[PDB]
Design a protein around this ligand. Structure first.
Ligand SMILES: CC(C)C[C@@H](NC1CCCCC1)C(=O)N1CC(F)(F)C[C@H]1C(=O)NCc1ccc2c(N)nccc2c1
Length: 236
């Protein structure tokens, strides 16, 4: 996250850190808890991932430095990538991880609600992006989970900013006209979380953007509402 601030423990309980362990352990991407056995993340996170065997899901993490060799993690049974997925920028940037066990929900591990039936035309004005990504181009993964509030921009506006890409109704964009606050490399797969009637909803999945916090270049997110039928198909 660019232009963000540190979170405090327990603040974003659906946030997970997805680690790879090949060739060595490191944070690969964010994700969100959407069910007891289910994490929603981005398809592009899996590019160099040989199989589910090398992955580890950590919940309840504030600082990456907390994760030690005795820190409990959830194994991944299955990575379900959308059948039409090809590359982040061409859309369908959505994956489910089916975990090897069911999370017992606690204060530090909670689900985030999908966008609700009946809420398709709701205007979300309290959206937040979270993760351990870069604070600049050519940075590193950050220790403390970062947060930044970011306004949604219309698809029309987003297309005018990305005239070399096909922005579709299955994407949603978010950013300030002057930049300064944005998601970045390593925030991939984490939530764009929006609070409506005091209930949080997973509105976006961090996907791609041109640079990070560059002016007039918003973040482009997977528009979760348009995949709710696909999610429910795979999770039932
Ligand atoms: C060629 C470009 C059109 C896209 C390209 N630009 C990044 C910028 C940072 C250094 C690495 C390359 C891009 O995003 N990605 C390349 C890819 F498809 F392999 C994966 C994807 C990526 O890095 N996802 C993370 C990301 C980056 C910038 C973001 C951002 N600025 N806002 C919200 C969300 C943002 C999320």
């Amino acid at each position: 996250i660019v232009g963000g601030t540190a979170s405090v423990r327990g603040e974003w309980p659906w946030q997970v850190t997805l680690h790879t362990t090949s060739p060595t352990q490191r944070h690969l991407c964010g994700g969100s808890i959407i069910g007891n056995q289910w994490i929603l993340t981005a398809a592009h996170c899996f590019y160099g991932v040989e199989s589910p065997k090398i992955l580890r899901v950590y919940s309840g993490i504030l600082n990456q430095s907390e994760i030690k060799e005795d820190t409990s993690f959830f194994g991944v049974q299955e990575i379900i990538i959308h059948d039409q997925y090809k590359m982040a920028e061409s859309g369908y940037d959505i994956a489910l991880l089916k975990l090897e066990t069911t999370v017992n929900y606690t204060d530090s591990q909670r689900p985030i609600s999908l966008p609700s039936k009946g809420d398709r035309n709701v205007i979300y004005t309290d959206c937040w992006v979270t993760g351990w990504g870069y604070r600049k181009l050519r940075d590193k993964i950050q220790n403390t989970l970062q947060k930044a509030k970011i306004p949604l921009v219309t698809n029309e506006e987003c297309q005018k900013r990305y005239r070399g890409h096909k922005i579709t109704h299955k994407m949603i964009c978010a950013g300030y006209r002057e930049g300064g606050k944005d998601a970045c490399k390593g925030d991939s797969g984490g939530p764009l979380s929006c609070k409506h009637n005091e209930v949080w909803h997973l509105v976006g999945i961090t996907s791609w953007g041109e640079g990070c916090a560059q002016r007039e270049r918003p973040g482009v997110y997977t528009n979760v509402v348009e995949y709710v039928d696909w999610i429910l198909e795979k999770t039932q």
